[PDB]
């Protein structure tokens, strides 16, 4: 049926839908923000730094992810406001 029309083209609404849904990993690290802070141990000379950087490197990578995704979604939430605003 779709032989003269590019019906499969992503409407930039569905494109944002798969932006949010088909993201890389989801919420495997975003939740540490809520988990870490809320309202004996074995910390030795070498048992204090367990390569904590990658956790922060992954945190910064997914922070860039979140910034980009919420930029795409702050170009899309104003859709609802501006369409009522017409």
């Amino acid at each position: 049926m779709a032989q003269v029309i590019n019906t499969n083209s992503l409407s930039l609404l569905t494109q944002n839908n798969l932006n949010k849904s088909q993201s890389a990993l989801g919420t495997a690290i975003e939740r540490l923000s809520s988990g870490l802070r809320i309202n004996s141990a074995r910390s030795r000379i070498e048992d204090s730094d367990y390569a904590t950087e990658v956790s922060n490197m992954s945190r910064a990578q997914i922070l860039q992810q979140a910034g980009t995704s919420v930029l795409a979604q702050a170009n899309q939430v104003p859709q609802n406001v501006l369409s009522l605003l017409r």
Partner: protein, 1353 residues
């Protein structure tokens, strides 16, 4: 509280917005209504006396945004002036504030619906003179007393007793002192000075200045102030420089309809005289009721019984003869409009010429917009309320002003040529002036009597004046002599406007029209000359001010589309929704020509329901160009090819600035008639030519057309040029992000020949090793679509998190592009080889099963590695991780200098940023529906057993319950998979919610991964009963399953299982001895801080047929030597990954020194301080060959034999990851320069040297100064050694290794103690922007800290 609150959203058409926009207009609607109410209450309310006139109301619309739906003209007609608070227009009479335009037609309907008590709608004197109002009103003294009967201020100050409240700023005292006498009308103050009945008074203006400016003959002003003051005030402002008060009295242009509420004249169908064609369709010679539908005031648009009025444009219908409407529309008819209004002799030649000009300009053919016959089939006079922007340029200064239509109409006293693009609105604007000079709806043109509109490209360089006038404006109606026609220009000196069109191609103008445009010393006639942007230099030497026709505002296009597609309004709403998020494409509608093309395509080709409308716009513009230029088809094709070649030179070099040399190289000639539509010669500074096209995106579409006409051409040279310009698209990012719209433009043409070429080029962009560095695209072209910047950052982030998923996204969009090419060109049959070769080994999502390529070609499912699905479920996820301990508690000195404070971000700051991100996500998704997968269309409901996909890895987002509509889809789609993998993260409870789904297809499972959750007895039976299971994985569990886990030891056809656990685990002893099904172990992963192991002494750990992975561990004390003596036994176990002190002294000598069968035994996390035990251990462990990810373990005194260990590791020519842990003697550090790495290891990729203690002497050096072409090290993660090195080693590394490169692969930098001042962060930014990794490189230097920084002051 009823009047205080107000609702601006109608719920009749809210489900339509819910269906189109995809979300119910309820939550955001209520929030916006509330916020509008609060700020409307906050803002000032009352009668804005000064700017009560629609002239000032529209003057306040200069700052109004051009992306709207209601036109400023209509907004001011309804009285909604621009208050300035987020477009919050206000009823000037009662302060009814409407923050946003909407449906309910023109703002008057919504005005009445919301607040029907703005006294505006009563008709009494409120002070609402029109937008084109003239201050000089008519002299209608008609009074007892005459000019001179009273001579005192107190004699006539009694008249000002009834002074209206809308003119309170101008106190009656100053007016009386200025000779003004109140009459009784609104403010028609008939001055005591020789009549002088001028008045429209606002607070802050000077009555003396106005009296001088409009009257130089006022005896009162002559007596009060001298002629010097009169002449000084006459120069205060630029207005009617040659018009007295007597011109307006017997003016040949007069009013037609009242302008108190200037909406009953905004439409051309207002008066009966302006509807001659719409009225006299019935010939007078007929014996029928010729004037049946005429005298009623109803405008008739060629439809038999569909007649509408001008009172409110009512739907009074069903007469067909001229009778009463008392048949079907008695009352309560839908969208009622009509009831909203009624229920509540050298000069006589010039006069005749003006009359005939007005009659000809009122004619339909001239008046109607130059829309295509499909568009202009009906009367297109509802678009006359659409104006274009105007900007005046200074004489020499680079200072420009934005003037509205009343401003420009007032200021017409010298030469001001109009400039723009080809057909960009010069003809439309000049016709609008010619028609509003005759329609009476513009009192500002009651001065002009000989407004002239002419096209100068149809005139020979030696023509006359009346000849052209009769041949272009009068037709056969011109028969008067020209003896006094050229004398009427001197008997009416300045009040003569010239709407000169098509002056561009003229150098020697006709002599008769040469004394009126060349010297402005005698005529001083106003000039309005239409000049393309490519020919302004001819006149620019002879201008004081110059007009420009700027971009057509988006609200004009929206208005035109609304007027046209009034029945299929839903399509126009879809278009508006498209352009709301396509912010880059708001300015695409460069021209009413573009608008016309869109309308014609929508009506004809039925492309109204097309998800993309900019492609439709540009394709329709191409169709318009092809249809108009079909006589000169070959010149048009040559021009298109040359200009698209110019675009190929420019955009592919990311350039939009073009000169004569560039245009000549492209192949365009600077003297072609029809190249203006594809080129405009801008004068860049003041005299240097530069070239810009009709639009900045029409140039990209031109590039697309040139590419398709080069790739679809039979000439081999054409094919070579097309392929040469294809090859510059060498990155998938260019095809997906920047040239994505460009390639969609290419694909819009159903090119049968070019589709295989483009598809092969696009699908060849991704191979085993692609030049990903070409994703660094120049920013100037990305500036054309800022959405390209946004999506580029998104794809880049998806790249840094997970290159495989980023590649899946890019490949899915590339396959969508390729399939769009294939299906649009109907070339699927010959694109099948390329498409199949591309899809071989792909890892796309599940939505890709809904493209036609798997219904038309079902077999294609067998080539994809996987088609994974994931549903974004929501839950609180009540968990407790242990990232807080030992990382958010201890070691908290934040000593700093306060010049580097940007390095450390407090946990509060990042939590605030994450909360803002979660807030925007929740705003997006709370209004969103559940968002189930789209499996609606076709293919799935097929009988004859099409195919079975290899992998259907499922991973739901923190969900524990399968909805009635989710579990059905799960069990329907799981059957399609021959190997259903299971990715269950934080899904402690979703197992039994997928138990019905898995029961029907239990065997087809191959892996079940369980990450950081707790299982239940009622669901563990399913996992224990997976017959053809290959794998099961349970990991990241922090608590021992002493009693919560029921039974996981006895599978049915087990091939591998994992019970990984954290905290204080003893998994080698938990799940008691009964392990009936451990028969064909293949892949197990259990990290274990071991507490007991003897339970598995003679157990399965020796019976491993084809085991691959072993993610075991031993940490503190529990019989390490015994456990790893009984566990180090391997027969074919490949991957034996570890995370701590795994081996021991004499219990790692059995087969590891003397075997090969290893793949991913990893030793990254090894650290123990004992010396002699490590010294007496590492004589064993020998060498292996099939190993791939062997990393180096720890040991303080281990180096003496670890040098021999790495010497044997040199005999492992299949490794890719390595660590080189904890070398201390610093004399064996030279051994690992050519040991393993460099000296061998042909395919090493990763090399992490995390937390070393003795990289101070050479260390880093051998890895940065002795590389010598080791070109596969893609991940060199070298964390620093704050307790083991000094500093300047890093600087030397940056100076040497980075400069020498010598490695086409590397990875980013390290952190945890290192920061410097802000001046050289710009230096490192510039360095990042230097080498080609600029647009991909991120330098990780920010530490998200839980401590507030403390300055060491």
């Amino acid at each position: 509280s009823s009047e205080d609150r107000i609702s601006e959203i109608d719920y009749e058409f809210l489900p339509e917005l819910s269906a189109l926009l995809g979300v119910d207009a309820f939550q955001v609607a209520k929030s916006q209504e509330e916020e509008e109410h609060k700020e409307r209450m906050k803002m000032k309310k009352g009668f804005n006396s000064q700017m009560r006139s629609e002239a000032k109301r529209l003057k306040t619309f200069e700052t109004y945004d051009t992306f709207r739906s209601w036109t400023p003209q209509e907004m001011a007609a309804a009285g909604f002036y621009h208050t300035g608070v987020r477009l919050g227009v206000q009823c000037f009479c009662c302060s009814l504030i409407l923050f946003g335009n909407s449906l309910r037609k023109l703002p008057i309907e919504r005005h009445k619906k919301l607040r029907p008590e703005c006294e505006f709608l009563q008709g009494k004197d409120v002070g609402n003179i029109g937008k084109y109002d003239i201050r000089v009103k008519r002299p209608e003294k008609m009074l007892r007393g005459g000019k001179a009967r009273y001579h005192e201020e107190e004699a006539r100050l009694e008249s000002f007793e009834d002074w209206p409240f809308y003119a309170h700023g101008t106190s009656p005292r100053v007016l009386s002192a200025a000779g003004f006498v109140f009459t009784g009308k609104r403010d028609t103050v008939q001055c005591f000075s020789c009549g002088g009945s001028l008045g429209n008074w606002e607070e802050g203006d000077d009555p003396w200045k106005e009296h001088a400016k409009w009257f130089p003959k006022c005896e009162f002003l002559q007596s009060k102030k001298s002629s010097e003051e009169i002449a000084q005030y006459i120069q205060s402002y630029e207005g009617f420089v040659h018009v007295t008060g007597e011109h307006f009295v017997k003016s040949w242009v007069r009013r037609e309809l009242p302008m108190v509420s200037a909406y009953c004249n905004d439409s051309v169908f207002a008066n009966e005289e302006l509807r001659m064609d719409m009225f006299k369709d019935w010939p007078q010679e007929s014996p029928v009721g010729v004037e049946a539908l005429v005298r009623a005031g109803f405008f008739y648009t060629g439809k038999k019984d569909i007649v509408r009025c001008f009172s409110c444009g009512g739907c009074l219908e069903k007469w067909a003869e001229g009778d009463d409407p008392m048949e079907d529309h008695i009352k309560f008819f839908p969208e009622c409009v009509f009831l909203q209004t009624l229920k509540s002799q050298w000069f006589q030649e010039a006069r005749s010429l003006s009359e005939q000009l007005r009659d000809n300009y009122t004619k339909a053919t001239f008046r109607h917009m130059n829309l295509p016959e499909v568009c202009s089939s009906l009367g297109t006079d509802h678009l006359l309320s659409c104006d274009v922007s105007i900007i005046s340029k200074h004489i020499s200064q680079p200072v420009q002003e934005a003037l509205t239509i009343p401003e420009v109409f007032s200021n017409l006293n010298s030469v001001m040529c109009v400039e723009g693009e080809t057909g960009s609105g010069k003809t439309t604007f000049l016709k609008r002036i010619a028609f509003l000079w005759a329609s009476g709806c513009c009192p500002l043109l009651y001065r002009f009597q000989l407004v002239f509109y002419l096209s100068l490209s149809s005139i020979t360089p030696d023509q006359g004046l009346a000849n052209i006038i009769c041949a272009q404006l009068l037709g056969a109606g011109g028969c008067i002599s020209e003896v006094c026609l050229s004398s009427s220009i001197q008997q009416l000196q300045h009040q003569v406007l010239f709407l000169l069109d098509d002056y561009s191609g003229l150098a020697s103008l006709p002599q008769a029209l040469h004394t009126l445009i060349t010297k402005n010393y005698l005529s001083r006639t106003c000039l309005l000359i239409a000049v393309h942007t490519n020919r302004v230099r001819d006149i620019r030497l002879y201008l004081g001010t110059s007009l420009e026709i700027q971009e057509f505002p988006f609200y004009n296009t929206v208005s035109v589309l609304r007027k046209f597609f009034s029945h299929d309004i839903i399509c126009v709403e879809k278009l508006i929704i498209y352009f709301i998020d396509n912010k880059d494409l708001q300015g695409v509608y460069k021209t009413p020509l573009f608008v016309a093309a869109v309308c014609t395509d929508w009506i004809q080709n039925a492309s109204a329901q097309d998800k993309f409308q900019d492609v439709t716009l540009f394709q329709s513009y191409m169709q318009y160009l092809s249809l108009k230029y079909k006589a000169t088809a070959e010149p048009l094709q040559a021009t298109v090819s040359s200009c698209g070649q110019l675009a190929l030179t420019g955009l592919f070099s990311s350039c939009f600035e073009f000169n004569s040399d560039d245009l000549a190289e492209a192949g365009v000639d600077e003297d072609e008639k029809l190249t203006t539509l594809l080129m405009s010669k801008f004068t860049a500074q003041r005299l240097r030519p530069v070239y810009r096209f009709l639009g900045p995106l029409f140039q990209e579409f031109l590039a697309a057309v040139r590419l398709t006409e080069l790739l679809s051409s039979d000439r081999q040279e054409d094919q070579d040029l097309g392929l040469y310009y294809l090859r510059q698209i060498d990155s998938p990012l260019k095809a997906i992000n920047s040239f994505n719209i460009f390639l969609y433009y290419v694909s819009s043409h159903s090119s049968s020949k070019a589709a295989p070429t483009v598809v092969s080029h696009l699908l060849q962009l991704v191979d085993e090793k692609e030049s990903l560095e070409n994703m660094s695209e120049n920013e100037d072209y990305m500036k054309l679509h800022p959405q390209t910047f946004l999506w580029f950052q998104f794809v880049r982030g998806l790249w840094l998190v997970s290159p495989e998923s980023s590649s899946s996204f890019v490949s899915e969009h590339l396959l969508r592009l390729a399939l769009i090419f294939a299906y649009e060109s109907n070339t699927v049959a010959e694109c099948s080889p390329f498409i199949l070769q591309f899809l071989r080994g792909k890892t796309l999502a599940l939505r890709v099963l809904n493209l036609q390529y798997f219904r038309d070609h079902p077999e294609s499912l067998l080539l994809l590695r996987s088609l994974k699905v994931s549903i974004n479920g929501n839950k609180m996820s009540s968990y407790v991780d242990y990232s807080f301990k030992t990382y958010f508690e201890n070691l908290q000195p934040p000593a700093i200098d306060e010049e580097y404070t940007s390095a450390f971000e407090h946990i509060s700051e990042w939590r605030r940023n994450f909360a803002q991100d979660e807030e925007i996500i929740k705003n997006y998704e709370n209004i969103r529906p559940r968002a189930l997968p789209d499996i609606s269309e076709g293919y799935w409901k097929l009988s004859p057993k099409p195919c079975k996909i290899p992998k259907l890895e499922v991973q739901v987002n923190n969900t524990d319950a399968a909805d009635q509509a989710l579990l059905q889809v799960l069990m329907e789609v799981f059957s399609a998979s021959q190997s259903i993998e299971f990715r269950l993260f934080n899904s402690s409870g979703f197992l039994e919610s997928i138990c019905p789904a898995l029961e029907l297809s239990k065997a087809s499972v191959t892996k079940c991964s369980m990450s950081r959750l707790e299982l239940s007895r009622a669901e563990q039976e399913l996992l224990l009963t997976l017959p053809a299971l290959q794998s099961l994985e349970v990991s990241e569990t922090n608590q021992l399953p002493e009693q919560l886990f029921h039974n996981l030891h006895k599978f049915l056809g087990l091939k591998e299982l994992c019970v990984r656990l954290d905290g204080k685990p003893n998994v080698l002893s938990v799940l008691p001895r009964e392990f009936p099904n451990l028969l064909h172990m293949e892949k197990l992963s259990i990290q274990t801080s071991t507490e007991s192991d003897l339970s598995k002494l003679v157990k399965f750990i020796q019976n491993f047929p084809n085991l691959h992975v072993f993610h075991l561990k031993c940490d503190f004390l529990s019989n390490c030597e015994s456990l790893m003596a009984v566990l180090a036994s391997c027969k074919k176990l490949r991957e034996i990954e570890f995370s701590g002190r795994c081996f021991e002294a004499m219990t790692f000598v059995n087969i590891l020194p003397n075997f090969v069968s290893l793949k991913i035994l990893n030793l990254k996390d090894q650290q123990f301080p004992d010396k002699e035990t490590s010294e007496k251990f590492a004589q064993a462990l020998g060498s292996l060959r099939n190993l791939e990810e062997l990393l180096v373990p720890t040991g303080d005194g281990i180096h003496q034999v670890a040098k021999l260990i790495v010497r044997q590791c040199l005999q492992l020519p299949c490794l890719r990851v390595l660590t080189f842990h904890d070398i201390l003697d610093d004399d064996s550090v030279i051994e690992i320069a050519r040991a393993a790495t460099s000296g061998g290891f042909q395919k090493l990729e990763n090399l992490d040297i995390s937390m070393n203690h003795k990289i101070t002497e050479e260390g880093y050096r051998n890895f940065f100064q002795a590389l010598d072409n080791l070109p596969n090290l893609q991940e060199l993660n070298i964390c620093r050694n704050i307790p083991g090195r000094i500093q300047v080693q890093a600087t030397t590394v940056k100076a040497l290794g980075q400069c020498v490169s010598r490695l086409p692969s590397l990875i980013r930098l390290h952190m945890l103690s290192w920061l410097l001042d802000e001046e050289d962060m710009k230096v490192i930014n510039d360095v990042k922007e230097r080498h080609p990794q600029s647009k991909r490189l991120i330098i990780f230097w920010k530490l998200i800290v839980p401590f507030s920084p403390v300055i060491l002051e």
